[PDB]
Design a protein around this nucleic acid. Structure first.
Ligand SMILES: C[NH+](C)c1cc(NC(=O)CNC(C)(C)C)c(O)c2c1C[C@H]1C[C@H]3[C@H]([NH+](C)C)C(O)=C(C(N)=O)C(=O)[C@@]3(O)C(O)=C1C2=O
Ligand SMILES: C[NH+](C)c1cc(NC(=O)CNC(C)(C)C)c(O)c2c1C[C@H]1C[C@H]3[C@H]([NH+](C)C)C(O)=C(C(N)=O)C(=O)[C@@]3(O)C(O)=C1C2=O
Ligand SMILES: C[NH+](C)c1cc(NC(=O)CNC(C)(C)C)c(O)c2c1C[C@H]1C[C@H]3[C@H]([NH+](C)C)C(O)=C(C(N)=O)C(=O)[C@@]3(O)C(O)=C1C2=O
Ligand SMILES: C[NH+](C)c1cc(NC(=O)CNC(C)(C)C)c(O)c2c1C[C@H]1C[C@H]3[C@H]([NH+](C)C)C(O)=C(C(N)=O)C(=O)[C@@]3(O)C(O)=C1C2=O
Ligand SMILES: [Mg+2]
Ligand SMILES: [Mg+2]
Ligand SMILES: [Zn+2]
Lengths: 159, 58, 209, 105, 100
RNA sequence: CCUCGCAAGAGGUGCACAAUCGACCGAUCCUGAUGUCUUCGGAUGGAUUUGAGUAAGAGCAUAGCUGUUGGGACCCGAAAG
RNA sequence: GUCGAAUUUGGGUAUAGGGGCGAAAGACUAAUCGAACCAUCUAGUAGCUGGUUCCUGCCGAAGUUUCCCUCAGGAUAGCAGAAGCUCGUAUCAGUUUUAUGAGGUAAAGCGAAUGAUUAGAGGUUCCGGGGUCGAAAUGACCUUGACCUAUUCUCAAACUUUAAAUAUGUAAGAAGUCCUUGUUACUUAAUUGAACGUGGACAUUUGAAUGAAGAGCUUUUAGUGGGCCAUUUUUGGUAAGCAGAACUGGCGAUGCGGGAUGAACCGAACGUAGAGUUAAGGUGCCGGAAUACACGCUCAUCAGACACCACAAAAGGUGUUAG
RNA sequence: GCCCUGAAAAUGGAUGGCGCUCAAGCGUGUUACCUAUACUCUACCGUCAGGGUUAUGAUGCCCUGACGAGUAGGCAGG
RNA sequence: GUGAUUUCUGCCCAGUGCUCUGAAUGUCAAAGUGAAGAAAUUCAACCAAGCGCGGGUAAACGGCGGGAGUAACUAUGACU
RNA sequence: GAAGACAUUGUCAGGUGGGGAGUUUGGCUGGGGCGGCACAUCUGUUAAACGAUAACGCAGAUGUCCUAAGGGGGGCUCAUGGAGAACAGAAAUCUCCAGUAGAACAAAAGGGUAAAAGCCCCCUUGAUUUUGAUUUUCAGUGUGAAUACAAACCAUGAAAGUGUGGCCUAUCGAUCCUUUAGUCCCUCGGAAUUUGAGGCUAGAGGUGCCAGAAAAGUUACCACAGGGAUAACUGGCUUGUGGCAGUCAAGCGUUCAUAGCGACAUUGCUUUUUGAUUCUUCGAUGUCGGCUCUUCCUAUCAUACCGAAGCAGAAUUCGGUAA
RNA sequence: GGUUGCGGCCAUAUCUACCAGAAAGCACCGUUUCCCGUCCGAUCAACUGUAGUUAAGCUGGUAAGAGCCUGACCGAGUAGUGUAGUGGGUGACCAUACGCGAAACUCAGGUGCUGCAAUCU
């Protein structure tokens, strides 16, 4: 009566995108993963071998093993009162890189640069990010912009 | 004698009463499941590196 | 038999239509959806009158048919048969279920059909000439007597059934970009091919009156 | 299901650790000899008064048995067992099917 | 609860056999196979039979009833037939003749 | 803990313990040297294998709380054999 | 009812417990009989019922997962207490931001696919069906279907191009980055790469916010494993103080002020006193607090009076008020 | 909008009751006032944490701060 | 077993029982017999009653259905 | 006098043997029973856009099949439609054009696939050996299924590569006992050799109640421990059904909607029926009807006083105040 | 700037109809001896670059083109949705407060960009 298979409730999850069926592309085949990289798991439905479980769809982990056609990803999952580490063997079509990780690398390069100049001219660095400070004092010109008065509209039915 | 079948009430409260804190990562994680080819090479490379450092230290 | 619309009134279940998973359902009581001179033109019938809902509910298919008859009978008896076009704008697609020991195996057989109506959804639409406002309003008053809930008779200021309120429809027609189809019209857009736009609308692409 | 009488598969023998030719037979169970320790224990336990002492199986539910093939290598005469799934019908070396032959009702 | 009383006829001998069981218990059901063969000639009690292409089936005893006697009369005046044979739990028997 | 420094720190040694890679012992699967009574012996070397192991011992005895099991087993209670 | 026999009755005698005896009722067998009474095994067993003895202090639940001839019970994980131990050295969060993912629910769509579906318009010199024109027509004039083209009305838990909000994954360096060069049986055409390294550089912002009434770990063991209610989402049902789920909070286990009264609603959680101020609710009297102030509506020959909540609808009214 | 008709249940009967009609009803607004074991301040009791202290108690004496509900249950002191 | 007297007790031996001078071992234990072996043992035949095959018995237990066509009103069906 | 090495008797073996003895006679469940399997599994939905998630919710399916329908490689494009070609027509075969998949991929549903995963052809046996790691259900146990490697040996292909059965999600099984395969292995404990037996490593024989007892009923003669976790009264919530009353008004009523009715609808009330539920009660509320007796309601049968009529009178019908 | 070979993103590139292409390249093209392959030198294999052609392929342009892509203060702060109230309403449901925020529609623009190597009036 009740079923929990490997791909139960995975209809729209393992569907392809619209006008995106067919062969998967050689950029996703030629990207390189080295041990320590951080990758995002989103399953591709065309390649049935090496597919992850539905729990790991859209999930981020650290690659620990790189082999012939797959990579091994460590994912923390929440069961009970503890997180468990899971070691998945997923193929490179289901594995993609993490744009948060590349932007973090560009930010550490920019920070290293900024500290390098700030040390060269002897000025304090101001390196860490600050959140959105509220606002500052401002002047607005009425010249060419006289405030137009708005009033609430009456009720007219359109149907 | 019908009864209640399944309920997820209070489960999140018990879990967060003793929370989920962390998997407690370390430096040098375990090499369980890495490729045996290049695991053997890792063994020999570390042996050679230790011997080279000891020989340079004298 | 014949349970009340008060026990089938509110929208409580998901829409349950006739599909490959739900067969052997009975056919609805309403079969005809357009009455009056249904071949007339929007140039013939300018004024629109709408009977619209104000509650989220379920109208019975047979309530639709009963109100359709009483309306059409009153309009035909008073103003003749060719003075109006009545179109019912809701279709009964929700299959309503009846149970008929205990609550074991309580999923029921199909009983009837119903149309789910939303707040601000038109139930009845009548297009007619300007002189027949009183008879159209009275006929839809009989229709709202026979439907459940609270409904509103609104004077729709669109030329006929279509769109494009009366000054706008005038400007389009004496501009000439409106072509008379059977019981509706076709419009000229500035996005089609020039060749078929010429051979479909010569009056706009001529110097005619 | 149809399986051929011959099969080139791996041989465990120390003189031939490569793929060698094997003849394919079926494992028929042994004679169930009388002097096995469990049989002697059963005879002593059933002897006397008390009736039947160990359970006897009644609620058979499965019809099929897994077929297991006995492979004998043609060079070293060593044997192996390969398990094939539940099949109702089984033919060692039946006629090969024909792709597109004239059907004959 | 309800219990089932079954009255059945053994087909190979034609003998009445009865049974009584609780309606929730399991019962063995024989996997009978009915096959439609061609009769070549009625030899010394052991009818010769033909498959779709093959021709082994030479073991079925010619049916001793009046059905088999009328079958013998048919084959004796020729009028070639196809006969229907049942196979079940190791035993096979000709049950019904049919003119082709 | 030690050395320098009034310091903030810089270095050295780092018990217990934690993580990890090794090394050794038994089992398993191989590898099969000198000899050989010609079928024994098992050297040397391994291995995504495995153990309740080693890696400068911690145990023994008594007593106590609590928990377990068997005993009537916290007390009372059957229809029965 | 029967009353001279298949009668009644005394004494003696015989039959003894899975046995006797029975003109049969499972009757009778010492007030005991569908298996007597006594003693022993025996304090038989019980997942079931009842009881379970002094005080105070501190901490404090669960009715959920999996398996079991399992559903009135156990085992196991969880929740709790205690004993602590290693550090109190850069470690975390029922939280937000910044960056980056994932999803196909609400909505929306059908002149976009699938399925449903109302109505006309035009066309097919290709007869699908019924005709007519000279019984003729492998001919015209047609009706009528069908099909196509462009429109049109309405939908879809097991339809979808698009696609939210709320929840959800990861990261925010010192276990990091950069530069030369050491090992390897891995890898490469290769002094190329991969992994781990040596050495050197990286301070009044070691690289978002806010908090930390400490962080981490281990052992042991109890009770529990009948739950119930409320807001929102939702399934079956006509509906239910009905049955079953999801998130959260409560009651159980919880008094106190208010809802007259109430396990759950509102407020607020509790050592013992004093003073002050409030919450929710109130201020004619019962009853502590304005028969306060202000602007209007309503007269009921069934007025109305405060959430949960302890009921009222369709339809009407030259009652009155406003538009 | 309010009110009226629709509007019928069985002991006597319930805006809580009395009662209320420019209300003590309804809608909205401005203040004043009432009081909870809640909050603030103080005292005292206990527990926890951090500390200070080399003639009659050093598991003692003292200082500082926080906290205190509770069934099944666990532990401690009597 | 039925239950005075009077009258009668119909049909069915497939099932289940019961029974027999029915038939051949089809199956058939222990002991006994033969072959192989170094023996433990293994495999054969022979194999009693019984079971199976056959017959009888219902004042043994018991059972005793349908469906069509068919007669000058129609309707039913003596009949098939 | 009769029988006579027969029979009796003693011990084994087969049959028969409810006469007798033990024991059993699943679970879930809107009470239990019958039914069904929601008991081991798989797909879509419920499921509320991570995961998880219930009901005897909905729509279905499994206990098979295949030496090819497994593996590799190559050539081609599939449903469908149009135009044509003797017999030949709607449809037999052949072409051409269009043809994003509307076909097929063993089976249920979903997903996936176009110089293929489809259809034909060639070669094959990766449906192989040794154990490990990981994912799913999960206690992070087992079973099943699957994933990625390693050391071999192979298949295919020119090669890159691919292949550890079925394109993916299902197609299945512990201890004990029996049997088979492996080395030429260990033991039979006074010492040897052969058969025999017991071991180690991997399979099979099967437990569908699918973490796996060997198992028919009846009890109204019944018994015990319990249970309001659970049924048969009453009460309670609900009102489908029963009953009663409205709103609208096609029509009947000679014409005339509304004197009287009133179809198609639709809005309510009652607990005077039967359901639905299982909140109270199983250490007991005496469970139908009748007799007797009191009170209450009004949804008025009669009586009092009135209104309407298709009310001339008489009789009658509808309604009001009224219990 | 073309063209070829190999490609990346995979319609801004596709589809329909019509025009243009000087050079080189590509293509169509000619033959069956060999290797090879078919029912068939049509595909495939081989040989020549000669006998010819830009007719097609290909490339580019045009179309108030279909489609696709981008944007908008167009629709629309709308539908929807978190959180709150002793808010409203008999209910269905709705409004407000603090936040987030679509899709269709309308309109405007666009119709492949690019990497390596070789060759070209
Ligand atoms: C600021 N100090 C008090 C400090 C604090 C923490 N931890 C915290 O930040 C506080 N922890 C919270 C955040 C509250 C959980 C700290 O964690 C530390 C330290 C000190 C450093 C000192 C380091 C130092 N050198 C490298 C600059 C040094 O001299 C040594 C050494 N060579 O022995 C250290 O011990 C030092 O490396 C060290 O360990 C420190 C900390 O870890
Ligand atoms: C991020 N900050 C809080 C930090 C973190 C860690 N550790 C980590 O990154 C986290 N630990 C992991 C590796 C994840 C396990 C850290 O380990 C440190 C520090 C702080 C530094 C500051 C150092 C500093 N430098 C410039 C010399 C400095 O001025 C001194 C000094 N000489 O006084 C330090 O104390 C400093 O050396 C120091 O101790 C730091 C850390 O060690
Ligand atoms: C049961 N035995 C004791 C027996 C008894 C009788 N007659 C009696 O009733 C004895 N009465 C007497 C002593 C004559 C006064 C008998 O009459 C018989 C039999 C045996 C049968 C056996 C039959 C058997 N099969 C066919 C079952 C069989 O194999 C044989 C044979 N060929 O050896 C027979 O003898 C048999 O067929 C048979 O005839 C028997 C008797 O006649
Ligand atoms: C009718 N009688 C004459 C008989 C005949 C035969 N033989 C046949 O039927 C042979 N005829 C064939 C052809 C087989 C059909 C019989 O075979 C038999 C019997 C009867 C019994 C005799 C039995 C007797 N007992 C009762 C004391 C006897 O002497 C012995 C014995 N001690 O050997 C029996 O066993 C006996 O029971 C027996 O076996 C008979 C028959 O079978
Ligand atoms: Mg430190
Ligand atoms: Mg440091
Ligand atoms: Zn071999």
């Amino acid at each position: 009566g009740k079923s929990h298979g490997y791909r139960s409730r995975t209809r729209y999850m393992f569907q392809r995108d619209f006008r995106k069926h067919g062969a998967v592309h050689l950029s996703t085949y030629l990207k390189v993963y080295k041990v320590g990289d951080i990758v995002d798991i989103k399953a591709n439905g065309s390649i049935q071998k090496g597919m992850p479980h539905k729990f790991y769809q859209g999930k981020t982990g650290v690659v620990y093993n790189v082999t012939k056609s797959s990579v091994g990803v460590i994912i923390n999952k929440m069961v009970g009162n503890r997180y468990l580490e899971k070691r998945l063997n997923l193929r490179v079509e289901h594995i993609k890189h993490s744009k948060c990780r590349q932007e973090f690398l560009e930010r550490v390069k920019a920070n290293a640069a900024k500290r390098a100049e700030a040390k060269a001219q002897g000025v304090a660095v101001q390196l860490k990010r600050q959140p959105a400070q509220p606002r500052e004092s401002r002047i607005v010109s009425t010249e060419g912009n006289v405030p137009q008065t708005l009033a609430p509209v009456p009720y007219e039915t359109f149907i | 004698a019908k009864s209640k079948n399944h309920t997820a009430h209070n489960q999140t409260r018990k879990a967060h009463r003793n929370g989920i804190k962390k998997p407690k990562t370390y430096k040098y994680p375990s090499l369980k499941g890495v490729d045996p080819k290049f695991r053997r090479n890792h063994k020999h490379a570390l042996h050679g590196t230790a011997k080279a450092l000891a020989a340079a230290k004298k | 038999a014949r349970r009340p619309a008060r026990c089938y009134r509110y929208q409580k279940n998901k829409p349950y239509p006739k599909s490959r998973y739900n067969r052997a359902v009975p056919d609805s009581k309403i079969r005809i959806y357009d009455l009056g001179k249904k071949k007339a033109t929007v140039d013939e019938f300018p004024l629109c009158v709408h009977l619209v809902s104000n509650e989220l509910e379920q109208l019975s298919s047979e309530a639709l048919e009963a109100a359709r008859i009483c309306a059409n009978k009153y309009m035909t008896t008073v103003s003749g048969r060719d003075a109006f076009h009545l179109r019912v704008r809701v279709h009964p697609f929700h299959v309503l279920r009846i149970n008929k020991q205990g609550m074991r195996g309580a999923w029921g057989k199909p009983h009837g059909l119903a149309a789910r109506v939303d707040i601000g959804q038109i139930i009845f639409s009548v297009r007619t000439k300007d002189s027949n406002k009183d008879v159209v309003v009275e006929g839809l008053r009989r229709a709202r007597y026979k439907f459940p809930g609270q409904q509103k008779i609104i004077l729709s200021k669109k030329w006929g059934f279509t769109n494009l309120d009366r000054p706008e429809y005038l400007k389009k027609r004496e501009a000439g970009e409106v072509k008379d189809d059977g019981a509706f019209v076709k419009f000229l857009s500035k996005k089609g091919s020039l060749e078929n736009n010429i051979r479909e609308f010569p009056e706009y692409f001529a110097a005619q009156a | 299901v149809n399986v051929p009488k011959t099969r080139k598969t791996y041989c465990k023998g120390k003189t031939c650790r490569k793929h060698t030719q094997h003849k394919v037979t079926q494992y028929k169970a042994g004679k169930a000899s009388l002097f096995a320790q469990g049989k002697r224990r059963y005879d002593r336990k059933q002897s006397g008064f008390g009736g039947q002492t160990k359970p006897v199986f009644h609620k058979k539910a499965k019809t099929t048995k897994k077929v297991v093939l006995r492979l004998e290598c043609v060079k070293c005469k060593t044997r192996a067992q390969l398990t094939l799934k539940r099949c109702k019908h089984f033919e060692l070396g039946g006629e090969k099917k024909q792709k597109g032959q004239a059907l004959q009702f | 609860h309800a219990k089932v009383h079954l009255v059945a006829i053994d087909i190979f001998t034609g003998k009445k056999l009865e049974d009584l069981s609780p309606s929730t218990h399991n019962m063995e059901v024989p996997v009978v196979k009915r096959n439609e063969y061609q009769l070549l000639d009625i030899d010394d009690g052991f009818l010769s039979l033909m498959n779709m292409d093959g021709d082994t089936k030479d073991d079925v005893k010619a049916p001793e009833g009046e059905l088999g006697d009328s079958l013998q009369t048919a084959f004796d005046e020729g009028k070639d037939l196809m006969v229907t044979i049942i196979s079940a739990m190791g035993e096979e028997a000709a049950i019904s003749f049919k003119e082709a």
